[PDB]
Amino acid sequence: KFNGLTVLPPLLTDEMIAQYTSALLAGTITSGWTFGAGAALQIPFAMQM
Amino acid sequence: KFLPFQQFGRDIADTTDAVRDPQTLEILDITPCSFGGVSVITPGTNTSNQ
Ligand SMILES: *[C@@H]1O[C@H](CO)[C@@H](O)[C@H](O)[C@H]1NC(C)=O
Ligand SMILES: *[C@@H]1O[C@H](CO)[C@@H](O)[C@H](O)[C@H]1NC(C)=O
């Protein structure tokens, strides 16, 4: 870092990335896949299987 | 810590690291002065100027 080299921190921290991944998992586990097109719906997991 | 005959430490790649001094015996340390790349954040100059 001394001479001329600098490093810039990323715009999105690790906590925000974890929050997005958790949101995606939560959508997939319950809403099925309708939230990938429009509004999020709900449906039991066995029916999705 | 220096040996009784060691001066002018480089200690990373080529930088003049902590060095002793004449007339006395102390292990002084040298650090570069603070520096940084300033930046300006501005809105549209057609709107305001602050
Ligand atoms: C250098 O000279 C000063 C002046 O008298 C003296 O106080 C000091 O002890 C000397 N130091 C050495 C390392 O010769
Ligand atoms: C924004 O810029 C346009 C032309 O560059 C100018 O006509 C307009 O007045 C500006 N907006 C404001 C709020 O002054």
UniProtKB/Swiss-Prot annotation, chain A:
Superkingdom per UniProt: Viruses
Function: Subunit of the fusion protein that is processed upon entry into the host cell. Mediates fusion of the virion and cellular membranes by functioning as a class I viral fusion protein. Contains a viral fusion peptide that is unmasked after S2 cleavage. This cleavage can occur at the cell membrane by host TMPRSS2 or during endocytosis by host CSTL. In either case, this triggers an extensive and irreversible conformational change that leads to fusion of the viral envelope with the cellular cytoplasmic membrane, releasing viral genomic RNA into the host cell cytoplasm.
Protein name: Spike protein S2'
From Swiss-Prot, chain B:
Domain of life: Viruses
Effect listed in the UniProt record for changing residue 13 to D: In strain: Alpha/B.1.1.7
Known glycosylation sites: 46
Its job: Attaches the virion to the cell membrane by interacting with host receptor, initiating the infection. The major receptor is host ACE2. When S2/S2' has been cleaved, binding to the receptor triggers direct fusion at the cell membrane. When S2/S2' has not been cleaved, binding to the receptor results in internalization of the virus by endocytosis using host TFRC and GRM2 and leading to fusion of the virion membrane with the host endosomal membrane. Alternatively, may use NRP1/NRP2 and integrin as entry receptors.
Subunit structure: Binds to host ACE2. RBD also interacts with the N-linked glycan on 'Asn-90' of ACE2. Cleavage of S generates a polybasic C-terminal sequence on S1 that binds to host Neuropilin-1 (NRP1) and Neuropilin-2 (NRP2) receptors. Interacts with host integrin alpha-5/beta-1 (ITGA5:ITGB1) and with ACE2 in complex with integrin alpha-5/beta-1 (ITGA5:ITGB1). May interact via cytoplasmic c-terminus with M protein. May interact (via N-terminus) with host bilirubin and biliverdin, thereby preventing antibody binding to the SARS-CoV-2 spike NTD via an allosteric mechanism.
Descriptive protein name: Spike protein S1
